[PDB]
């Protein structure tokens, strides 16, 4: 059926050139305009422009001219959108959408954007990759672990290797003024749970290949 499938998330340093792809399947590719729209973190939608897969003609929004370029392949039914010299203010999620929605009349002849892509999250930062610094937190009683200074914000915390799954709460991360992320995860236990079992926090940070297991004792 009709869908557009986009590329995977990008984390790049400024001065780089991010190119996002959008694969069109389920319909005759050369039939419809494809637009690109971006969404700044937690903000609204801003149109970037469109491209016609047939002729290859393009139209860029005023704000988005001379630095962004849209392309088509056809041979593989995919449109691309490229930021050749990306900056920190370019961090956002990018959507492609197909104009397959039929028109009413001749007074407003514009195909509406019905099927949208999944979006591609592009993060631009001059911060470099950093392995996390896990610290144990001393204490119903609350335990927990504080993981600081790491990049990017893609990570996972577990407890005693999959054991503790009940009273676990992993908080979302904060982005600091340095460009590095931080988070904490905490467990609420019955007030005499420390003596019976000592707990251990497990941190998996794939982008730096760092895994730490930290024993938590008062």
């Amino acid at each position: 059926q009709v869908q557009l499938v986009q590329s995977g998330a990008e984390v790049r340093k400024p001065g780089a050139s991010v190119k996002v792809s959008c694969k069109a399947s389920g319909y005759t590719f050369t039939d419809n305009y494809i637009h690109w729209v971006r969404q700044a973190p937690g903000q609204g939608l801003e149109w970037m422009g469109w491209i016609h897969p047939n002729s290859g003609a393009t139209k860029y929004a005023q704000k988005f001219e001379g630095w962004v370029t849209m392309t088509r392949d056809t041979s593989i039914s995919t449109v691309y959108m490229e930021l050749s010299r990306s900056r920190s203010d370019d961090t956002a999620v990018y959507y492609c959408a197909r104009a397959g929605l039929e028109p009413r009349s001749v007074d407003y002849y514009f195909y509406g954007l019905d099927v949208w892509g999944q979006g591609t999250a592009v993060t631009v930062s001059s911060a470099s990759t950093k392995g996390p610094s896990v610290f144990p937190l001393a204490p119903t009683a609350a335990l927990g672990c504080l993981v600081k200074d790491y990049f990017p914000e893609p990570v996972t915390v577990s407890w005693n290797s999959g054991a503790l799954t009940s009273g676990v709460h992993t908080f979302p991360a904060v982005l600091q003024s340095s460009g590095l992320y931080s988070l904490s995860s905490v467990v609420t236990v019955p007030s005499s749970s420390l003596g019976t079992q000592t707990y251990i926090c497990n941190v998996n940070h794939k982008p730096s290949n760092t895994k730490v297991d930290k024993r938590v004792e008062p």
Binding site: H35, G44, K59, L101, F110, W116, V174, S182
Partner: protein
Amino acid sequence: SALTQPPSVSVAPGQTATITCGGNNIGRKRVDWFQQKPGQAPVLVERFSDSNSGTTATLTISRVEAGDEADYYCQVWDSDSDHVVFGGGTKLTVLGQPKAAPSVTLFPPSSEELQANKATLVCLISDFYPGAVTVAWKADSSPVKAGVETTTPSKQSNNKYAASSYLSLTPEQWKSSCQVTHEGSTVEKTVAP
């Protein structure tokens, strides 16, 4: 053009909400409405119905549920320039929850942190609603607006919001509390060697 949209609309379940995209010369132009649930791509849109006063286009949702909660954007197309214009966005909140109180948890530095010559205090706020808080730190009853990191309230799986705040200071300043405000009802903590 430029479409002006109300920033926020709040409505109780099983009611009818209207969102007003406002422009000029919206005469022969047809406005399209998009529904974007948090964290998802937007989708174009028997309770949903639309209207156009020629100066105001309105999206109407009759008998609102919970799965109707999202950001709604309106958009048109300026034929003269060939530019697609979008609205500002409306966060539709469906009041399907009762007041609640934050659960503050303050933890001391893990000694080893001092061994690395740092001091970071963590204040954890969970299970609160409505979704805003005015956190404020203090060192020995004196305000501290220096090295504060806070987050945007974030929705839990259990439908409440949670946030955290970290205090970035030095071990020097350490052995030489946490105050969270929510609708006037201030909650406190403790800091001591």
